[model samples]
Structures are given as structure tokens and as C-alpha cells.
Target: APKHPGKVFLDPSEVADHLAEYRIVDCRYSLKIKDHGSIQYAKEHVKSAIRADVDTNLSKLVPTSTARHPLPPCAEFIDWCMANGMAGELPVLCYDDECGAMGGCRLWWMLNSLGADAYVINGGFQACKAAGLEMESGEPSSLPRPATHWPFKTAFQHHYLVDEIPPQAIITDARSADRFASTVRPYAADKMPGHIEGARNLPYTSHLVTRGDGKVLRSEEEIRHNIMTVVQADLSSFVFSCGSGVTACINIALVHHLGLGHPYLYCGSWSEYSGLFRPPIMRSIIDDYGMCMQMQTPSLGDNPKANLDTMTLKVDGAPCERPDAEVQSAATHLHAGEAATVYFKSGRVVTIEVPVVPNLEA
Candidate 1:
């Protein structure tokens, strides 16, 4: 029987009381800042807790085009746990500082896949501090025990790889509404900037609530209400995913607690899935308010309008310009790519994707 039925997050006070029964893990991490978790855990962390490095310990951190943080090899993680005295079905408690349990959530998912009953701290490290629990500061020293096998399973039915995802799986992206709607600036020019096609969006933060000064998991009823409002589908068919597979577990845990269908996690998530395609070419010379900022055109070697210098002629508000050099040799490439042209007041027409058949041979 589970101590906390239908709950994947335990409050800080609850964690405080049952401290002895749980193996606490400091899952604090920064995506860009190197060694943040280890450094922070060395400074201040839960009493008698061990640390899990999101990059080095928890994920492969390899330069894979598919995913940013690929799941660490299962055998390596199990061995890591065994080496750290986290042995055999020990109930694990994971927490991070974001109050969102992003790192904690990823570790929790991994821990559960290794057959350990793992739960996340509702409000994370600061929440633990506010709960007045005894904390420790120093390098963590655990008595290493002989390596033993934790119950490891091969087939992760709940885990989804990028290519194997079913088309109609009701995939839910746990990204911001603007990111989902493609209304915000992209993370990078190299990476695709929008949500998965045909994916519904319910941001991961919606499942959390700020109680007083601490962020905590919302009640089951409130979570259900939110799910209904945003998802509006058969709850059983839930596929939770996010930017890099870290925050998606927050949604997966919450939905699983609701007794909805076994919520699947798209492990590669948007980072991997989106990386499959080159980012769509965005050529916007006009501003959102119907004002043109600039006009662009490739040099057309011998065209009559190629060297137009008349009227200091500004097209709409965009200053149209002819280049000093004529790239006549590569003119076919521009025309084949259908690169935007300075149409003298065609009013910012967006060109269709040009066919590569005209110039490209490879």
C-alpha cells in the first residue's frame, strides 16, 4: 500500500516528518551553468541527502542531434544508485530549486523506471528550508556498499522514443502558450521554434500553485479542472512531453495520480522531435502592425530594375535597395529558392517555398 495514495509530490512538511524513511536526492541543476547541482549540494542540501547531477549523473549529455538531454544509460544509473548506498526499492525523494521540480521530475521518472517508488518535493529546496527542517552543508559522504542489482526493467511502456510515437497518441506539449502558438522569439535559429504538429499545449506550471511564499502542487480536483479545460479529450489517452523531456514528468506524474491512462512520456520531447526538421524559413520584412521595416532582394544581374536609384524610392516604409555587386552567376539559386524580392509595393507578399528542382542537383 502506498503511503501517499494518488500523489506523486509530497509537501515539505510531509517530507520533514518522514525524513528517516526516505532516501532524499538533491536534484538541483542549471541547464547552462556547469556543475551547479554538485556545487550547490556541497553548499546546502537536504540533511543526509545525496546529489544527482542532471548532466553527468542523470543524463548522457552527449552531442546528439535528437535530444539535448538524452536519458543516461539505465545500467549506469542503477549502478550509480547502488554505489551511492541507494539500494533496493528505497523510496526516493527528489527536489530542485526551481520550485517546478524539473530536474527532480526527470530523476523521479528515471527512478520509477528502475522500479523505485520515487516522489518529488512539492515546492523544492526553498520549500524544505521554509518547513524548518534540519539541513546540511558540506560534501556528501555515503558509505559505499557492494554493487547490487536494483529491479531493472527493459521495456518501458510509458517511455516513448521519437520515431516510434503513434500519430494519434494525443501528444500534449508542456511548453508555454506563446511557444506553442509560434508567437515568441525562437530559442535558436538552428532549432525549430514551434510546438509539435497536432500537439495540444498545457504548460507545466499550471499544475503548481503558490501557497504563501512556497510553490506547491495543486490539489487533485484543481489539476483535473485544468486538464479538462486545456486538454478536452479522453484523459486516458495522454502523452506528456516538453522542451527537453525534463518538465514533462511533472505533468505525467500529476496525470498519473489522477488515475488517468498510463501517461506516456515522449522522452526526446520537442528538442528531439523538432530537431528532425530544419527550421522553417521565416522571411518577414514587414512588421506586425502592417509597417514595412526593410525590403530585401537578391541582385538580378541585367534586369532593368536591378539598379534602380530613383525617388530615394522607399517601398511603403521599407527602404528598397539595389546592391553594388551583381551575383548573376548565383541568380538561379536565388530564384530557385524563391528568396523574397523587393516588389515595389506588392504590399509584402510572402513567397511560397521555391522548388529546388530548378537549380539544385544534389
Candidate 2:
């Protein structure tokens, strides 16, 4: 199928032609397990193309305190941009996988959130490679430049969050049906949950080519239908979400292609909101708080100051005593690999995920 003429999508070679002219940022977002882009990008990428690791450069894939991948403040992004020489009128081009797996669209969303005028490589990596650009191995020559005096010009407003998610607001997720249905396992999460509350799944790939190379996005009418049917909302009150905020931008772009209004992205996706938090914010928070306080209390056993045990856990039909270090060690491998949970064939489950290693193999 032919590519769309109205949209700002560009080919890899076309992007390569003006590589030095623009601030080429590689938002080649990917999961920790996927090493395809890193292997290829580490070898050689477009000159001045700043590589954005989805989990690292963009966000925290796992929940730290507040969220898994909270959008860093504009000041933080500004510092990153100016330091990397990304600020200015330079045309910023980003790409990932056409399937939207690479987080190319995610970068597009973030760039827009920063209110930077940017374009996405429509076809992603597949189209880029097929476009016949020279592929080389080894790291690029340029080292990161230090931040100089550059006046900050923030374009995006922080009115894109749920606090600002709008009255008629609607959210669309870009994950598979199973993942969306809470029946299948998501990428990197402790909870086996489905969509975020009041969210609808509209996987980004659905916006791409149906059969051939996804160089062109779907028709405006088709895209409009996606927004109306699957997402089940009008254009005015739309917000996109995904594992992180990457591919959600593709959905927004496609919706925009339909002449719909620009949509906001929920950068702090289900990956973050689904985790633990104090005074847990949810529909049941008010009631849960009362119940929680009543259930948890300091025991008056002998002397309160002489309390030897605070909490207890059952392991292998035996009670195991623990301290803070032991608890941390048990849950997360501070030094070595801890086991993850796995369902056994005999209708039993075992904990066996690796915790000792971070995603970077660091």
C-alpha cells in the first residue's frame, strides 16, 4: 500500500538525508528482554540521534515509589534536551518498530508533551532497514555534549494528567486483547491485572498496514472508526496509554490523521498505577483506609520496646522469622537472583522470576 501524503511520516533514507540538519532523536523504545534495537543501534545509528532506552532513558519500567514510569517533570526533560542539543527549531525525527513495539510512537508522544514539533518515522525499523540505509557496527563517534546556556522554552502544559484528564475524558490502551483482558501476562508487572479502570484497548498495530509493510497508517475513516468503536469515545476527550507511553502516540497520531484533535498521553501507564502505594488512590481508598487502620495495630506483648517480631510469613509449612534486610532479600534479590512466581503443570505455583539482575544486565 502507498504511504499517506498528508501526514509528516518519513522514510529512513529520507530521515538520513537530513540527519545532520535536524535534531534526530532515536526513541527506539523496547522492553528489557528485547535486544534487537540495542544490538543494531549500538553499532551505528543516524548521526546526532540520541538513543532513548524505553525503560531507562524514558521511564522506570518497575514501580519505585510513586509509579513505574512517571513522566519526569518538564524541567528534567528540558535539561535532557538542552544537554543533548535537542532544543531549538531543529526538526526532530523519531522511529521505533512499525508494530509500535520499539516505542518510536512513545517518543513522539513525549516530544509532543514537551510541545516539541516532531515527526515519527512511519514505518519504524522494518521500513528503515528496507529503505536501504547503510548498516554498520560499533558505537557512533560522538560523545554526549555538556549543557550550555540555553533559554528554556517549555511548550506543553501539565494539564494532560488525570487531575487534568478533562471532564469528558476517555483513555485508550495499546496492548493486546489477552493482556488487555487481564487473562494474559503483561510485559513486566507483579500483578496479573487487566486494563486500567475505565480504559479501552486499541492496540497501536491496528492503526498500521493490515498486511504489507506498515509504511502508511490506516485511512482517516478507518481510524475514526477505531476511535469510536474500540475506544468508544469522541475525539475531544481522548487520552492514550500503553505499557509505557510510547505506542500510545501512534494512536494519537492516527487519530489526528483523521482530523481529530490532538490527544494527551498517559505516560504513567498501567505499569505504574497498578503497583503498591501508601493511602492507595483508587475507588475504594476511603473505605479501605478505615478497614486497614482497624486491622493493623501495635501489639501490647510484654514490653512494646522489647518487640522482637513485627510481621510473620509462612514458608514451606513453617514459620520464618525475618528482619528488614531479610524481607528485602526475600522479595528482591539485592545481591543474587531471586525466584519469580510460575504456575506449575500440576495445578500448583512456584516463585521463580529472577530478581538479582536489572534489565540492562548491569
Candidate 3:
């Protein structure tokens, strides 16, 4: 059995029953919307749940040059924990509206990794309300800030590098397929968009089943099936990554519960890796200058103009690209001779299909 009753996740009813015994934390956050987590907490939250806004409390106030949401300094986090009444062995029950995808489970991972027995409420605050649990508005009193450092024990994994990433590692990305394909480019401190090269795509949502307005964690077996669908084998060296290293914790926490190996969260993730240039790309394209593209096929090289015949273009629903859009990419030149989908200047998507040459497998 795990140290915590719920291990990685617990039922909402269990949360309701254990309200008095656990410290419930609302880890809701939104990158685009400032103060989202704190706002959500103020609106209405579990009777006793405290707010740990993802940006403010969970991450460092000062952003690192190479990454956004850099992990808070250990001493800083310790002070935050003490100030928030989350120090010592208190079992934490965290949640976000989106079944932990929004950072509910992220707190679970953070707390657990820092040697606390922590769990995420499976369905978050929505499920609690749906289950007829109590709700309260307004902020709770904070514990006195600790002046001295506590015994901060941690087995924090190394920030896995693009080059030193273990060859045997299961480089799983917990981002949407579109982001993985660069079809839905997201903003980052760095320029390049798209997933880590050769990283498997398994959006955290895949591990959930949608409920009314939120989602619940899937059964262990179902989640297991989804992971195998990607790795197609028992997972070994697990490395979970995402846009800012937020949602990636969802996958890491689940595997930790499933008796899978202690998966490493790429703390820097895409934001840091893409910020630096040495990292290689599995697929990407240059600007509208010409057919300059890069994918898995190296024969296409960094410079090629195949006069691609764009077979289809899904320009609808594409976000309006600025008229003076800068050439934003981190992959290679585009000169293709196969069916390939691409996103340039944010929203525009193009599918170019040409006669398949011997090595063009894109």
C-alpha cells in the first residue's frame, strides 16, 4: 500500500470524508489569465482548501532567462509551505477544475517529490460540488511564516537534457497532438514550437474521462492501456514533459501511483530545451521564403525547394496571424516530397502531398 490513502489520486467522496484530516489545496491556474488560481480560490473552494496559485506560490517569482515557471528555490518553497500550513507530513489533497491537468495534480507531484504524502482529488473542485460537499468563499488564514529552514529532503531528478536524455527513456510529452505537430503553436519564453524530438505524445486529457464541466481520473487499467498504446511496451525510463512543465506532472504522478518507475519531470521541459538551439528537431519548417522544411528525413536536409503541391489547407479556426509575422521556428528548411502538415505564423495550417520518394516517410 502507498503512504497516502489515495496514493496518487483519491475519490472526491474520500476527500469530503477526510476534509478535517487533510490539507486541501486548490492548484488551479491559467497562463494567459493572470491570478486565475487565486481568483478561482476566492470565488468558491472546498471548505478548508488553501490556494497555491501555480504562478505565484508554486513557481519562482523571477523567471529564468531560459525557461518560464522555473522551480522555486528549495528554501523559498519551504517557507511557502510553512506559511501556507503545508509543512511536515500533512497529506495534501490538491485539485484544479480540469482533473489535475490545470495543476491540481501538479501540486501532488511537487509535494510528493519533496517528501510529503500528497494526493490529487480525482475530479477536483467541480466533482466535490457535484458530490454535494461543502463549499466556502473568502481566503483562509495563513500559518506564520517560518524564519528557519526545515529539513527539506528531496530526491529530485536531474533536469534531463536533450542530448543526455537516456536512450532507453520513454520521452513522453503530455501536450495536445496539435502542439506536438506545431499545428497549435503556444507561446513560450523561447522561439521554437513543437514537442521534444522523438517524444511520445500523450495529452494528460487522455488519462481522464470527461464529467459535466470537468474530468475525472480514469481507472488504473484504462490509463495503463493508453500509455501502452504510445510506448507499446512496459515503460522504463520515464521522462514527462509539457509546455511549461505543468501538465507533465499529471503523467508523472499517475505512473508513480501505478508502481511504474519514478518518472522524471523535465523541469525545464520545452520552454528551456527549445530556448537553447543545440536541441534537434524531428519536424518543423522555415518561413514563407520558400520550401524550406525539416522532418525526420535527413535526405531532405536543412535546405530544399521541392515546389510542394499543398493538397489541403485548414485555414479555418486558425488564429489571425499578424501581417508582419516574424519568422518563428526552431526546426529546419522546408523542401518536402511527401504528405506533410505544417503550421506557420501561429494559425495557418498546410498539408502538402507529393509523390513519395524512397526515403520520404513524413
Candidate 4:
């Protein structure tokens, strides 16, 4: 239908012909089981394809500072790229199990945002296997030698940073509608969840048209329909988000291929947003883990264990020291009518939430 399926998506057969010209990366991952993608890659992957882990390699987790799967430092990513031959002046290709919904497109988005030459394999691993391409099983006997220098250092930019986002940008939440609606939160410890204050819901899976064997992306007609019906906005101002910033790339890639507009990725999606909340308090005398504090605080101040002269607090009906400084620090970034939960240990551990409303001028 469309000529070549957008600017960045290449047919698997095309990738097979010029295999040596690109540094192919396997970007598979799983939420239920950690390291599942790497295990599968070891079992079988495209020949000479390197592995990129979403959690360890591509992101840095800072529970107190940023969202889960926050983009790692650019220098760290550059080092990784050089080590993997992606910085040796060769174009990069990425693929994954769920079409490109997993981590394949996520990596592509990252590289493309940096103005690097990158592409995603259309149909992903399934397409690669379906086309009867050469496959390698088990670990490689040896790895590629790391590049000594990256010539494209001057082109590197902070494309994934959220601070660069404008206030009027059209944000899309790629998670399921339920996840966006706060009805369910399977990945979060507490079921309390919701989308950003002004984001729209557009699950990444919607881009795929299901087949008996698996799902392939929709055609141009369907994509265009989605743009008008679902997105209903200018593509240039679009930003994407999800649980951990992984699946969000699927839709970003979709719009990218459609030549809609340049999309921005909110790397710390729901996981980071949920992390903003303090876990609900529980009252149980069974064990240490059973203790929960139901307050309105986000964190346990600077020194959770220290006794202070500010405010007296209780954990599961037990007297505990809660300081104003701790409360102040816990609610440091909170706006008016915001809340946080602070967790601490007493044999097992418990959480306390505290509500904070600082002066708007402060």
C-alpha cells in the first residue's frame, strides 16, 4: 500500500540482504519475568545481532529522583553504543517479539532522537523468522571489539529529556485504558494509579492488526484512521508515555512511519508516576511486613529513624517519631493537594503516606 512502510521501517528481506552493513540489535523484554528476553536471545537470534536490555542497559532507576526506566546519562549510553558497534559509523537495526511494541522501537526512538541513523525491522522477530532468514542459536563464541572513538559525538543531543517538553504538547499514554483510568495497577504494589494530569489514552497494542499466528501493524488506511479518530491532533506536538517508557515507542514509531510528526517520549511513564504516590497504610499485627501507615506523606523525611521534636507519628497504631523536617523533605516537590507515602522497616517493613500543601509562592 504505502511505499516502504515509512522512512525508518525496513522489510526483513531487505535487512537480510545487507546484513553486514548494519549493527542489528535484539530488543526483546518481559514484565512478568526479568531477563526473559536475554534468555530467549541466547536460545536464538538473528545472526550477529547484539542484545540491548531495557532495564539494565538503557535506563537508570531512581525511586526518589525520577521515574522507572529513566534514560541513562548520554555518556553512559554512548559508551554502550560504542561497545556494541552501534557507534562505529554503521546504521543500527532493532527488532523484538511483539512486532516492535516491546523494546525494539524503544531503542530505535532513542537512537533516532539523538539524530543517529536507526531503523526498526518491519514485523520484527516474527517477520524475520517468517521470511526464512539465517538464525544463530546459543551464545556467540566471541563478541565484537569495542570501538575506540565515536565520530558522531557532535550530533548527540538530549532528545529524551522531559524538561524539554512544552506545556501545550499533546501527551499520549500508551498503557491500557484501565491502567490510565486508575481502575487497575497490576505492576504497582498499590492499586492506586492514574494518568498524567492532561494526557490521552492510546494503548500501543492498537497499532497492530491481529493475525492467527501473531500481530502485524495495521496498514496505512488504519493508521490514518487512528490519527484522525484516536489521536485527533497535530503529530508534531505529540509525546508518548507508558508503564516504564518501553511500549510507548510502538505508537511513536507508528506515527514516525506515517510521517505524521516528530514524537517525544516521556521515559518515566506510569511506573514513575505511581512512584510519586505513598503506598497505602495497612493495620495488621501478623509480621513486620504487615505494618502499613495510612497517612498523606510521600517520603520518610531525611532521617526516618531519628526522633525529632516536631510531630509525633504512629505506625499501625504504634508510636513512631515523625519530624517536621522529614515531612517537609518528603513533600518537597509536591504541589498543593498532592500526597506521598513513606515506607520503613520494623523487622519486615511498613509504609506511611502524608499529605502536603506547601505555599504556592514557596
Best by lDDT: 4
Runs in model 3 deviating more than 4 A are: 1-6, 61-64, 142-164, 183-191, 233-236, 278-284, 287-362
lDDT score, candidate 1, position 100: 47
Candidate number that wins on TM-score, 2 or 4: 4
Per-candidate TM-score against the hidden true structure: 0.73, 0.65, 0.72, 0.70
Residue-level lDDT tens digits of model 2 in 15-112: 66656556666666445447766775776665556676666666544335435566666566667777776665465677765544456656656665
User: Residue 108 in model 4: shift from native, Å?
Assistant: 0.6
* lDDT (CA) per prediction: 0.63, 0.53, 0.64, 0.65
Query: What is the RMSD, in Å, between candidate 4 and the native fold over all Cα?
Result: 12.2
- Candidate 1 lDDT over 205-282, as tens digits, reads 787787767577788798888777656534545678887888787777777667664577887777677666433312
Clashing pairs for predicted structure model 3, backbone only: 291-334, 292-333, 292-334, 293-333, 293-334, 293-335
- Backbone clashes, each candidate: 0, 9, 6, 12
Candidate 4 wrongly placed segments (more than 4 Å): 1-6, 153-164, 184-191, 277-362
Q: 234, model 3: CA deviation in Å? A: 5.5
Determine the C-alpha RMSD for candidate 3 after optimal superposition of all C-alphas.
Answer: 10.0
